[PDB]
Amino acid sequence: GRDEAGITGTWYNQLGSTFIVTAGADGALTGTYESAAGKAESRYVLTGRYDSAPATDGSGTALGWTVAWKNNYRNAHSATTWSGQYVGGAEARINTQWLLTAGTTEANGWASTLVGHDTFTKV
Amino acid sequence: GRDEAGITGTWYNQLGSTFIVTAGADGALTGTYESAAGKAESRYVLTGRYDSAPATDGSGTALGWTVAWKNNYRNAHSATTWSGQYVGGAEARINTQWLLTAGTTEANGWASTLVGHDTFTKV
Amino acid sequence: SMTGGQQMGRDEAGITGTWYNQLGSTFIVTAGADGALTGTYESAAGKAESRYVLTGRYDSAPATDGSGTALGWTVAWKNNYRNAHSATTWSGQYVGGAEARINTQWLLTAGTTEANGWASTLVGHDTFTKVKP
Amino acid sequence: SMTGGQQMGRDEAGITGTWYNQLGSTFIVTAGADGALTGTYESAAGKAESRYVLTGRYDSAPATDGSGTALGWTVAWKNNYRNAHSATTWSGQYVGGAEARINTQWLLTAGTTEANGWASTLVGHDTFTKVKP
Ligand SMILES: O=C(CCCC[C@@H]1SC[C@@H]2NC(=O)N[C@@H]21)NC1CCN(c2ccncc2)CC1
Ligand SMILES: O=C(CCCC[C@@H]1SC[C@@H]2NC(=O)N[C@@H]21)NC1CCN(c2ccncc2)CC1
Ligand SMILES: O=C(CCCC[C@@H]1SC[C@@H]2NC(=O)N[C@@H]21)NC1CCN(c2ccncc2)CC1
Ligand SMILES: O=C(CCCC[C@@H]1SC[C@@H]2NC(=O)N[C@@H]21)NC1CCN(c2ccncc2)CC1
């Protein structure tokens, strides 16, 4: 797998959150996320998908994953999905944008979703 | 599981795309997506997460999932993540916003990501 | 014009007027001949009271292939009654015709400390029509 | 003022000037005393040529707790050289100080047919500084 080895490993973003991921041979992503920010403590299950056969033209590798913010310590009734691309090489990075949706009443639904961007670097 | 039965099943969105999902007992989401739009043909693997213990106060249930747009028929070098909440009842619906990231060169990276909103209804 | 009034572009008359979204917020806009959008916004939701000044831009010469007309506008949520230290931009398109519509997505950013910066921005979607709830 | 010039608010002087994002696009803005944002935009990327009019709004009385100052602005991508039938809104905050910054997210919506409506909108993030590349 071209990027299997490149994607799999331990990453950290600009907040200092940590993203431990394994890129499967079938395109699957699995691992754990630990947020340095928000209503989060310890590690949360993640799962996702990546393009296991990216273009050979210098293109990044598209990928995405979801965390639901429930674990054995806390439940923030929320989920974040990161959508981005892996860029291999010198400085491998995963450049993402994300959508954090909280469970709300219908009167509060208009304000359910935060949006942001995380840049990940490896170890 | 409160919403296990509610979330699991076959959903269709406003474009007529179909979202077949199984809500796991551990918070996992799995299934297949078939897009009525874009560079997509037939079904694509999805995986995601949902809050398996949502608030009892009339709140929706937060959830998210990823499709990488590679299957046996086509590869669009792209991934969509849907971020939203399930709202049970009369009219069960899953109200989402999504981020579609394509693999790009670094000169084209500024325009890598589309954003939209899909509303799903069951069968 | 032939009757003596001024000649309106396309979307000038269509966009200009009073609009309502699914929250029941009120969007009073005047589309300028130069591409300017001006007016007021009254939100039915959130930390908002009375009317807020808005300004924006729209494509005053849109494609003639059936496509909508692109536009956008900003409200900063400060007026003489309230300051929510935040601003919303709507980006969308106008779709003319029988039931005219403005279909938008929006980005609401709040002023924050650097430590709360990751959570500065809300995202959503509003559909506007000229029919009142 | 004491020397005879006009008294600038906070962010009035800080925001007003010439800015550059990581693409090397050029953002020339004047922050009005009334909360108005006006100026021009020259994009180094995409279907754009020369300068585009912009308008927006900013919080002219921001919190005094160290938080940034919220703002937003629209460009419709039509000028006398090019029409990309599309409009970008930036939503973000101004962070004053040693290296002042404007940290934004943006929504670029194109006019589309209803069948291409699902793909109307691009999303991204630009950081602006007053230092040129
Ligand atoms: O704080 C968390 C869980 C931790 C999120 C951490 C985020 S993930 C993207 C970013 N990258 C990181 O590395 N860390 C941050 N969850 C909700 C709870 C309730 N919230 C809302 C929001 C809007 N409406 C209603 C309620 C606010 C956030
Ligand atoms: O079309 C697809 C795959 C099918 C996506 C279907 C989408 S999922 C959200 C929405 N809800 C649905 O039910 N269906 C649609 N993928 C890319 C290919 C290259 N694209 C870009 C975009 C920006 N920059 C570069 C390249 C455009 C889209
Ligand atoms: O509520 C308002 C002002 C009114 C917004 C009304 C919104 S405009 C899009 C939608 N369409 C409408 O018609 N009406 C609603 N402003 C902030 C300030 C504090 N907020 C945050 C969020 C994140 N971090 C820090 C602070 C949350 C909300
Ligand atoms: O390229 C431009 C105009 C220039 C935008 C420049 C952008 S502003 C945010 C970013 N920051 C900058 O400094 N520069 C860039 N416009 C459209 C028209 C056609 N497009 C679509 C997309 C989706 N559906 C249909 C058509 C793609 C691009």
For residues C109 and D72, the answer to whether their CB atoms sit within 8 Å is yes
Residue type, A78: S
Q: Are C88 and C104 in contact (CB under 8 A)?
A: no
Rounded Cα–Cα distance for residues B92 and B97 (Å): 17
Q: How many beta carbons lie within 10 A of that of residue B25, not counting itself?
A: 8
Q: Is the CB of B115 under 6 A from ligand 2?
A: no
**Token digits for C47?**
């930390």
Please tell me if residue A106 touches chain C, with a CB cutoff of 8 Å. no
A53 touches chain B (CB under 8 A): yes
The helix (H) or strand (E) run that includes residue C14 is: helix C10-15
Q: Nearest-CA distance from B36 to chain A in Å?
A: 20
State how beta strands A9-13 and C83-95 pair.
unpaired
Q: Which of C98, A80, A70 is nearest to B2 (CA)?
A: A70
Q: Are strands C101-110 and D17-21 parallel, antiparallel or unpaired?
A: unpaired
CA atoms within 13 A on the CB side of A99: 36
| B9-13 and D52-58 beta bridge pairing | unpaired
- The answer to whether C121 faces chain B, any CB pair under 8 Å, is no
β-partners of residue B118 are B96
Cβ atoms D58, D11 nearer than 8 A: yes
* Of residues C27, C102, C26, C118, the one with CA closest to residue C70: C102
| CB crowding B44-60: b at 16 or more within 10 Å, else e | bbbbbbbbbebbeeebb
Query: Resolution (in Å) of the shown entry?
Result: 1.9
Cβ atoms of residues B63 and B29 within 8 Å: yes
Q: Token digits for A23? A: 């890129």
Q: How far apart are CA A86 and CA A94, in angstroms?
A: 4
CB B99 near ligand 2, within 6 Å: no
DSSP lists the bridge partners of residue B88 as none
Rounded Cα gap, residues B50 and C87, in angstroms = 31
Kindly write down the DSSP assignment for every residue of C43-76, as one continuous string: -SSSS--S-EEEEEEE-SS--SSS--EEEEEEEE
Query: How far apart (Å, rounded) are the C-alpha atoms in residues A51 and A121?
Result: 19
Which of C7, C35, C40 is closest to C94 using CA atoms?
C35
Cα–Cα–Cα angle for D56, D124, B68, rounded to 5 degrees: 150
Sign of CA dihedral D16, C51, C43, C119: positive
**Cα–Cα dist C41/C18, whole Å:** 10
| Coil, helix or strand at residue D118 | helix
Smallest CA-to-CA distance from D74 within D100, D25, D107 is with D107
Give CA–CA dist C87/A69, Å, rounded: 28
- Token pair in block for residue A55: 């273009």
Residue A1 CB–ligand 1 contact under 6 Å = no
Which residue reads 């919220």 in tokens? D70
One-character DSSP codes across B37-70: SSS--S-EEEEEEE-SS--SSS--EEEEEEEEEE
Going through chain C in order, the beta strands assigned E by DSSP cover 17-21, 26-31, 36-42, 52-58, 69-78, 83-95, 101-110, 121-124, 127-129
3-state secondary structure of B112: coil
The answer to whether the CB of D9 falls within 8 A of the CB of D35 is: no
Q: Do B113 and D124 touch (CB under 8 A)?
A: yes
Measure D63 CA to nearest chain A CA, in Å. 21
Task: Calculate how far, in angstroms, residue D38's C-alpha sits from the geometric centre of ligand 3.
Answer: 23
Q: Which of B93, B117, B118, B119 to mutate to test the interface with C (most CBs of C within 10 A)?
A: B117
Chains that touch B (3 or more CB pairs under 8 A): A, C, D
| Residue C18 neighbours by CB distance under 10 Å | 13
**Chain position carrying tokens 């194109």:** D110
Contact indicator for C33, C57 with CB cutoff of 8 Å: no
- Rounded Cα distance, B36 and B40, in Å: 8
Q: Where are the domains of chain C?
A: 1-133
